[PDB]
A paper describes a structure:
Leptin is an adipocyte-derived protein hormone that promotes satiety and energy homeostasis by activating the leptin receptor (LepR)–STAT3 signaling axis in a subset of hypothalamic neurons. Activation of LepR in turn drives the phosphorylation and activation of the transcription factor Signal Transducer and Activator of Transcription 3 (STAT3), which drives production of anorexigenic peptides that suppress food intake and increase energy expenditure. LepR is a member of the class 1 cytokine receptor family which includes the related receptors glycoprotein 130 (gp130) and LIF receptor (LIFR). The structure reveals an asymmetric architecture in which a single leptin induces LepR dimerization via two distinct receptor-binding sites.
Given that flexibility of the membrane distal D1 and D2 domains of LepR appeared to limit the resolution of these reconstructions, we next purified and performed cryo-EM analysis on a truncated leptin–LepRD3–D7-zip complex, which yielded an improved 4.5 Å resolution 3D reconstruction. Analysis of the resulting molecular model of the 2:2 leptin–LepR complex unexpectedly revealed an asymmetric, partially open conformation in which one leptin simultaneously binds both LepR chains, whereas the second leptin engages only a single LepR subunit. Consistent with previous mutagenesis studies, the high affinity leptin–LepR interaction, referred to as “site 2,” is formed by the hinge of the LepR CHR2 (domains D4–D5), which engages helices A and C of leptin. The low affinity site 3 interface by contrast is formed by the immunoglobulin (Ig) domain of LepR (D3), which interacts with the top of leptin helix D and loop AB. Notably, the canonical “site 1” interface, which participates in high affinity receptor binding in most cytokine receptor complexes, is unoccupied in the leptin–LepR complex. By contrast, the Ig domain of only a single LepR engages leptin at site 3, whereas the Ig domain of the second LepR projects outward, away from the second bound leptin which is unoccupied at site 3. Surprisingly, our cryo-EM data reveal that a partially open, asymmetric 2:2 complex in which only one leptin forms a site 3 contact with LepR is the most stable dimer conformation in solution. In our dataset, no symmetric 2:2 particle classes were observed. Moreover, computationally modeling a hypothetical “closed” LepR complex by rotating the Ig domain of the second LepR results in a predicted clash between the membrane proximal D7 domains of the two LepR chains.
Numbering used by the authors:
A (entry chain D): 22 to 167
B (entry chain C): 1 to 141
C (entry chain A): 332 to 826
D (entry chain B): 328 to 826
Write the structure that this text describes.
Amino acid sequence: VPIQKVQDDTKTLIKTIVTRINDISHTQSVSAKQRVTGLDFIPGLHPILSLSKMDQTLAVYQQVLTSLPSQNVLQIANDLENLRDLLHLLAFSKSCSLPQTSGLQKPESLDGVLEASLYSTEVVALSRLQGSLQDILQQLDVSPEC
Amino acid sequence: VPIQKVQDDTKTLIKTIVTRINDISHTQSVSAKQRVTGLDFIPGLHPILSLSKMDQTLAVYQQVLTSLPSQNVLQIANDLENLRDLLHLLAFSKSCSLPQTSGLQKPESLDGVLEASLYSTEVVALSRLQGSLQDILQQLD
Amino acid sequence: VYFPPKILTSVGSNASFHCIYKNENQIISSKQIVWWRNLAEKIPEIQYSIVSDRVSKVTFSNLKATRPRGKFTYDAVYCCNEQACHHRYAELYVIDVNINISCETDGYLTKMTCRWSPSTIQSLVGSTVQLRYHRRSLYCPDSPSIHPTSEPKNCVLQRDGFYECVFQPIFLLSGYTMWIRINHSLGSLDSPPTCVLPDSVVKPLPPSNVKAEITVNTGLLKVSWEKPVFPENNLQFQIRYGLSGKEIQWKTHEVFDAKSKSASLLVSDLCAVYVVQVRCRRLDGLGYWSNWSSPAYTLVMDVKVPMRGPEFWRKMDGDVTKKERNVTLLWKPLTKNDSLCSVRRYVVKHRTAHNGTWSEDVGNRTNLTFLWTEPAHTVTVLAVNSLGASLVNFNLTFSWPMSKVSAVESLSAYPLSSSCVILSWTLSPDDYSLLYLVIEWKILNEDDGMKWLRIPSNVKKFYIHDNFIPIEKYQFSLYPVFMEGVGKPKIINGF
Amino acid sequence: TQDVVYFPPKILTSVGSNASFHCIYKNENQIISSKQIVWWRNLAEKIPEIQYSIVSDRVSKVTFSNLKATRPRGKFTYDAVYCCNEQACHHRYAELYVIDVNINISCETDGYLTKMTCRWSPSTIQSLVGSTVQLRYHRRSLYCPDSPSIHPTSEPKNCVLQRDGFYECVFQPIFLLSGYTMWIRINHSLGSLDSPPTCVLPDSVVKPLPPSNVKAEITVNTGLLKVSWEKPVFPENNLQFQIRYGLSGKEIQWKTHEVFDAKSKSASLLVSDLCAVYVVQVRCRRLDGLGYWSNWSSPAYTLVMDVKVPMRGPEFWRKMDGDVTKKERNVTLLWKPLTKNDSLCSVRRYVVKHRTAHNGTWSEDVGNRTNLTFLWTEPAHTVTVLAVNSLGASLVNFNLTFSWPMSKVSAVESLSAYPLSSSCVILSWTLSPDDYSLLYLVIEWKILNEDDGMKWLRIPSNVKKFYIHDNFIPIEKYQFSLYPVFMEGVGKPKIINGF
């Protein structure tokens, strides 16, 4: 499989996930000013540059999403695991080996914060994932490092 | 009833019977050259001449058909008994007063081969009775 | 003595058999065994084999589907000595297994719907069907294969005779290897495996917000539509358009540009209602075509003004001694070529030396009656639609001095038949600026069977086609026309 | 007891049957003498005295005969007969129920000889409330008996009413030659009644399937439609076939015919037209008359084919295009399509054969065109137009020759035109006394100054006066040309302009 086709498919999945996040966000009209403490475990909007960090932060987001009781969020997590598969495929295409991000311990704060606010955590996680995923789409255009 | 009508009606019946066996046996075309064991009690290997032999043989064909569970075969057995009644009346018309002794069947091999070789039983029965019907057709004149 | 007594296999394989013939208390050699199927065909010796002196082996090849023979679903094969056959036999079963599976992706990318029909299975009673699948996280391989780890799928037989299989939620980029599993009392078989990628079978939603319009002053059928939501927006669009009526003569146009939201098409008639529908599929051609969009209907507006003002003629009622004479203007509705789409109102313009010019909106009427008093009066009828009046309009000037001018020298009428009459005339040699000539005719003593026709001044011989009754007397009048007004007409009665 | 005693009180009987009642009328405390008692039916019809019978001084009897079916009267399905002292009718009555036992039995046997179906109409049983319908049949070993009768032992059989309002029930398996005696049995609180039983032989009510593999064609040389078919497999007895044929269109005016020889699987019938498409259907039934017609066959369409070579060649003429001084002259041959009689069915192509003394003879295929233009260069040139269908050219064809030397031979002496009307003009002429072997004459006319008002007519050489029927306009000037035609070519024509 040509590397260009893999990159195009990854961009397709980026666009589709951004679209579905927008679709659920339209149904969830939440003020962005709601500052909820204890959410430091969700990756922040920071410059993400190399593919290893892509896989790591996406696995973190998927673990956060998997804990949400929403079925659409579950299918989003399915899309995230598929996108990790394609990120690893891109890693093989560039002769780089992403570390197997299977050792992320389940965040102990998930149980304490989801019970406090399932809905607000879902909203903020979706927003931060969407922003990070546009960050990825921009980086994928500029040949991100390993 | 006049005898000529009896005769022509019998001819019509027997040719209907052979046409029916032909139009059913088309799906079961067989080679008469092959001989099977255990079916000696099914006749048809000899020419048929006299009244009593016809009656006994057709009673045998009756009983062997009755053992077979097919609706078409049910109608065939019905027609066989019809033509047996016809031949009994024809014998009465021949002005021969011979006592009518019929029956005398010992069909346990019938049951064994029935539970053994259903397909073989039906095909050999139809073929042999078909041949016997043509032979008695020639003998009829 | 048979081994084995019954065999299961599918179309396209070989076969092998073993027989031991037992007669009385003796066993014959295998060199005399004669094989037969259905007691009707002697199997060629080349298919036979002698593995042992007492065992006869027969091998088949490329076995074909069996044709049902009454209640039986199998054929009986017989291993016989010479012509002596044992009553026992074997059993064979073939069954067709090649079954096609039809799947579609919903337009909302939530569910997988697979369908298939058990028609080939209907001939077997006692057989139980189960659908077995294995999903690959990667894409489908070139050669689908039955994976050892398979899963059962529940499918509902619909009224159509097809089983429908609903899978949800979905994984578009995951390969889905599929094959049918049948389970009879004698065992189980499998259909040829197939793998389907959900992305490749997407049927998009029908296009939305289909708006049809004929662009003004151009006559181009412009359509605007809203694109249904799709990944990459890589959609190939198909537009069908046709006349609005009992039968829509649908014409089609394709829009290759996936970025195009509106397009314009030429139409022959600018004044007809049209029906347009749009369907879309993936730009690469994969998946299905979407449902045809809702029909958009064009509204009949006036794209342009009428092209020519109606041709009109006057009727003179009023005594000759009277200077004031009422004038009745007679014109006709514009044709669809002249009215374009419609004529909304008739406005008759006037021209005088003293009162100057003015116009009278006659409305939808094709007649306007007015009094004539001034020596010089020019008139002109205009046809006005929603966009304005017509461009080219006929003028007609009335003059007292010019009416006394006699420009027609001779006149002759010749009836060709009840359907045609020849008109003959000779002009005066004077250099009259004849614009044209008006043949004006009616039945004598009839004041309402009135007819007239303009002809160019260059014509010398003219033919009139009408229902002419020879008994009736016809009055014929030809009028010379100029800048200043009409000259003195030539009038004859009869032929 | 009661003041009025009807014994038996209620009676059920059939049409035409005889029934009788008895009354004992008590008025107040006195029993009315039987001689003072009058009967009344539904209190609307007094029963006549002649039917009165006296059992005793207190018991009087009336015996209805040849009874007719009771007409339902609103909610009353019975005829109420009243025991009346003269005019004193007591409010109670006896109820008489009369039904028509004549229920026709319609039976059918399929062409497969495996299903027996029968129907009957319940058209009279509605007038009996609470009546239970049942079919009872009995099988005779062989044949139906001479006089049908109800067997003491019979077998009930359920039958179903369909939307047609008829009762439906069948038999399977069936006895081919066993008499079936059946009847309709009714059951009610007043007893049971039976229809007059009829016996049916299953073999006499058999109708077959339509005969298949019917083919139709037109005989090329004779002209009779050739049709072949195949008898249905069952029944095997000799059958008679009826054949119907007609034209193709919205309506078909069929014509009927029958064949009696069963052995004949082919037929031939006279026709009126050959080049149209006919439709034909056949049906079969037993020769003796037993059974029924087998509906009809599927419609069949014939194929139009050129039956024979065209019967005559087309009549043709020529147009001179070329100066008199020029020796080479264009010759535009002009003819018309063959009529249905002349073309028979079709003319596939026009082949114009030529003949010269130098180039011999050759033919030109003009296709479907009715005109042909060629240059005249030889002094002698014979031309013959051939109409060719699929089978070949036409048998006898018209010949025309062109010759420079005899083109100066003037054979026509006079030429006069007389207009009868706008629709007819007389042509009159006198001939030269020379012994000219004139084949025929050609009348060629046009409107003067009109180059496309070409019209022409060939007329026999023996004619001396001719009448032309065409739309003539007296105003227009007409040029008239009469051409003397000989074996060697066409002679010098005579030309006049106008009348």
